[PDB]
Design a binder for this molecule. Structure first.
Ligand SMILES: NC(=O)C1=CN([C@@H]2O[C@H](COP(=O)(O)OP(=O)(O)OC[C@H]3O[C@@H](n4cnc5c(N)ncnc54)[C@H](O)[C@@H]3O)[C@@H](O)[C@H]2O)C=CC1
Ligand SMILES: NC(=O)C1=CN([C@@H]2O[C@H](COP(=O)(O)OP(=O)(O)OC[C@H]3O[C@@H](n4cnc5c(N)ncnc54)[C@H](O)[C@@H]3O)[C@@H](O)[C@H]2O)C=CC1
Ligand SMILES: NC(=O)C1=CN([C@@H]2O[C@H](COP(=O)(O)OP(=O)(O)OC[C@H]3O[C@@H](n4cnc5c(N)ncnc54)[C@H](O)[C@@H]3O)[C@@H](O)[C@H]2O)C=CC1
Ligand SMILES: NC(=O)C1=CN([C@@H]2O[C@H](COP(=O)(O)OP(=O)(O)OC[C@H]3O[C@@H](n4cnc5c(N)ncnc54)[C@H](O)[C@@H]3O)[C@@H](O)[C@H]2O)C=CC1
Ligand SMILES: CCCCCCc1cc(=O)c(Oc2ccccc2C)cn1C
Ligand SMILES: CCCCCCc1cc(=O)c(Oc2ccccc2C)cn1C
Ligand SMILES: CCCCCCc1cc(=O)c(Oc2ccccc2C)cn1C
Ligand SMILES: CCCCCCc1cc(=O)c(Oc2ccccc2C)cn1C
Lengths: 239, 239, 239, 239
């Protein structure tokens, strides 16, 4: 398939419902060899069994809050994949008290800090830590949401963190392009269907197929882009 | 390949250099059955020989200046493809005097009219004329340029026509989405490489592979989008 | 006030409810000297009355469909205002059949042509005809709408004409900036409330006050810009 | 003039070259009553002098790194201004090592944290601390830069902090609009010329005059907006 001969690392698999799960299935179907990370002890077993279902046995701990954890993870990866062809960053977090009610009342310096650290900074923390490992032709991908560009109730400081993330995508695409790395995002629709042009919510399958494309040599002409995979929702008003 | 079982009509093939040529080759490689149009008597033979190289013998006249020509073309197409799965609109024109020097001095009411008529209106003229022929799952694609969103010297009234075209993409995606049709554009880089993140100009191959994706079921979650296939050029400043 | 010393031509005053009326009041309040145009002979008496209220006796017929009508009006205006400091373009039209129902069903070649010609081309047609009459520090302003940027039901081909208009603002700003002319648009909110951040619809006073600003030397740093005067409607989602 | 009756707090006046100085002059000229903050004790004497020139005796220490410093300053401001009509946030910082060389090489977790905290979070930290002191009709303003929207060499992690800042403008406008507060940004040009439409770099006077407008009731229709006061630089390409 169109990912044959690519080696891609997939973060963010927590359940069958995760966007990363959908991506990993589409990529496996298209011929990629996959590696997986897991945040913590709680998730390890689930990520192991998914990885085995998709023919992989590279399953490594990584908590992106910690530089040491990211560096250890990539050193472990290096033992099986001394070089590889990019990674999927499918990692977001804000403390729960951030995501309820009026934005100005809910946001705090600490909730802002963590939101941006885990949802935006970690994408470039990963890229720094594996830069010398990426083959020419490599592609990095992260996941954003319309909250980066619109004020959405309750999404609150997560929209600011997604705006920072989308800027990260541009700054990374520019920094890494000369070494043959591309960096993009998918702004996914929520996983309001009567006002979506395609008249349905997007699935992790739709997102997974767009992700596979954006990490493959098919998308060689695309870098620094935030592609809306939301069924046209963001381009409509008042349906 | 990922277009197997799709029937796609390709406009705009004038030479081996055309973007439509690149698209048609990528689509053929991915398994599509193709049909081609040609503007006029001058181009017919070239388009015939390309179509035969790619295993097609559906080659039909269409001048998008004329409603009758578009309607005749689709009636002819209907004899071999009573239904089909969308089309590639790769058609642009402005009179040559429009594209030289200061924009305000060069533009005229007539040059504006023709620019917008041929570069923007014809995309929806086609969609009107074949609406009842499109299978669910169909996808229409047109080609735009950064001139739609930036003032570029000499591109002049063609930037206004491309802005109209990109709006057309949104309005069409919204109108046709409920019948299972998607409508997108690729904003292609020029066919300034030191300030492009990927450090090279895009080719008709890059554009062709993005086009094949956007007309396939892989891109089911994408509609109303203008995807930049320009190597990240539009997202950079001052390199 | 902040338009003292400035001579501005105001098009498109058709009634007390016109946006151009709110604009003309705001500019007169800030001490601009004003002239007015009117489209045809049914509006003549009433624009004369509006102009007199604003201490102006300069009221000239102009149909922006015709190059000869624009040249004549500017030739007349030159008899009183050999030079002047810009104009407000508050002119929009599409045929009524364009603006109701499914976009792809309603739009026609002729309706697209007339919508783009009157609502977009006319702005640059006016610039062309008065370019040599403009002082250093002049400012041109037109009015646009969110339908340039999103698919809105019924607005249909106006949203394309508006997108062409906003690109016209950029190309015009770029062309004329070197000789000391700025060019901007207001994207005005409809003249609903519960999802607009300011929780009220904008008024012609709101718009007029922004228009006065954009035509005055207070906005000397702003050119080629589309300013949204819509109470924040466009930057909100899902309220 | 058009800020008569308004009480506005101005942060970030550090020298006569500061953007906040150009803003404070423009607002004082238009009859606003002003208060000022300063970051630490080296700036104190000189902000006192600038304030006196502008007929103000209200000059309060505030380090926006600390929640306690913001609360104290607003508690002090309340002794003279139990209510007031908004503030200008003209505060930006990243550590010096963040702003030179390859973005992915320079950025660190701590430099990202400090850049977002001081240049983005502080704008909403101030809003939080004075929300109950604001009159109906109040207006908040911050300063951003094109690096929010494009990858600019060296600006590096500031471009992420700025993108977060502009999203903060939208979320804040959306949250506070219902209680009668507007929130906007200026995206200012660098304070080069040959590709800017107006063919000159913008000045703190240009910026100040736009800031005065955005804080006055003349801009009652504008909220959650990023206004580009960069002479049209951002809307041009390839001059
Ligand atoms: N669910 C949706 O509707 C949409 C989600 N997104 C984004 O898609 C991405 C994935 O989301 P989902 O798959 O929906 O939810 P999820 O909860 O299934 O995935 C989130 C993942 O982030 C991981 N994570 C959190 N903090 C981490 C840390 N410190 N170190 C390592 N991993 C960490 C979790 O372990 C989990 O695997 C996120 O960036 C989210 O913002 C974007 C658009 C819409
Ligand atoms: N060449 C480039 O750098 C870029 C081109 N584009 C766009 O890509 C599209 C294709 O361009 P190219 O392949 O470069 O040039 P081309 O000249 O090879 O293709 C233009 C095609 O338009 C056709 N055409 C013109 N008027 C027509 C009419 N009345 N009826 C039917 N067909 C008509 C011509 O026959 C020709 O096949 C155009 O929309 C162009 O604006 C977009 C970005 C960059
Ligand atoms: N009303 C609204 O909610 C919004 C209106 N707009 C735009 O504001 C502008 C003014 O609109 P309105 O003040 O609402 O309505 P209006 O009907 O008062 O003004 C339209 C004006 O255009 C003139 N016009 C039309 N064809 C003309 C021609 N051939 N030659 C010369 N003048 C011609 C009419 O005589 C009239 O003065 C238009 O461009 C419109 O698209 C923008 C955003 C929202
Ligand atoms: N200079 C330029 O070309 C442009 C500047 N900007 C933005 O305009 C704003 C003002 O910048 P400038 O006037 O050029 O330089 P500046 O150096 O005069 O002003 C920066 C101000 O931020 C203050 N500040 C920094 N950390 C602070 C803290 N912890 N607490 C309180 N105050 C703190 C400094 O004391 C100073 O008053 C910044 O947000 C900057 O990013 C935007 C576009 C272009
Ligand atoms: C219908 C209106 C609101 C739409 C929200 C869509 C959406 C966006 C996301 O980023 C997301 O992920 C997170 C969000 C916060 C914290 C952690 C994560 C992983 C989940 N969801 C569901
Ligand atoms: C390097 C600065 C300028 C970049 C221009 C790129 C570019 C854009 C196009 O739309 C294009 O097509 C046309 C343009 C006008 C008329 C007819 C057609 C088919 C060709 N080219 C080459
Ligand atoms: C759902 C649709 C909401 C649109 C409301 C805003 C709106 C936008 C406009 O450009 C407008 O002007 C015209 C429009 C068409 C033809 C002629 C003119 C003068 C009026 N109105 C009301
Ligand atoms: C190629 C780079 C061009 C950038 C020039 C415009 C520019 C943008 C800014 O935000 C700025 O302010 C700061 C920037 C960093 C840290 C602290 C401050 C206060 C200064 N300058 C000059």
């Amino acid at each position: 398939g169109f990912l044959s001969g690519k080696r891609i690392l997939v973060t963010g698999v927590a359940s069958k419902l995760s966007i990363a799960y959908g991506i990993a299935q589409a990529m496996h179907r298209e011929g990629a060899e996959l590696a997986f990370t897991y945040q913590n002890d709680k998730l390890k077993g689930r990520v192991e069994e998914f990885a085995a279902q998709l023919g992989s046995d590279i399953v490594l701990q990584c908590d992106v809050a910690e530089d040491a954890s990211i560096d250890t993870m990539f050193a472990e990866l290096g033992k099986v994949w001394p070089k590889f062809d990019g990674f999927v960053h499918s990692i977001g977090f804000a403390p729960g008290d951030q995501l309820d009610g009026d934005y100005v009342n809910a946001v705090t310096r600490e909730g802002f800090k963590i939101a941006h650290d885990i949802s935006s900074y970690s994408f470039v923390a990963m890229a720094k830590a594996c830069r010398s490992m990426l083959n020419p032709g490599s592609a990095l991908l992260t996941l954003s949401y319309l909250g980066a560009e619109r004020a959405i109730p309750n999404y609150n400081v997560m929209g600011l963190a997604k705006a920072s993330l989308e800027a990260n995508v541009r700054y990374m695409a520019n920094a890494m392009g000369p070494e043959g790395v591309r960096v993009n995002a998918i702004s996914a629709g929520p996983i309001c269907e009567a006002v979506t042009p395609i008249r349905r919510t997007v699935t992790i399958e739709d997102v997974g197929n767009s992700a596979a494309f954006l990490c493959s040599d098919l998308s060689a002409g695309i870098s620094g882009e935030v592609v809306h995979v939301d069924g046209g929702f963001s381009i409509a008003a008042m349906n």
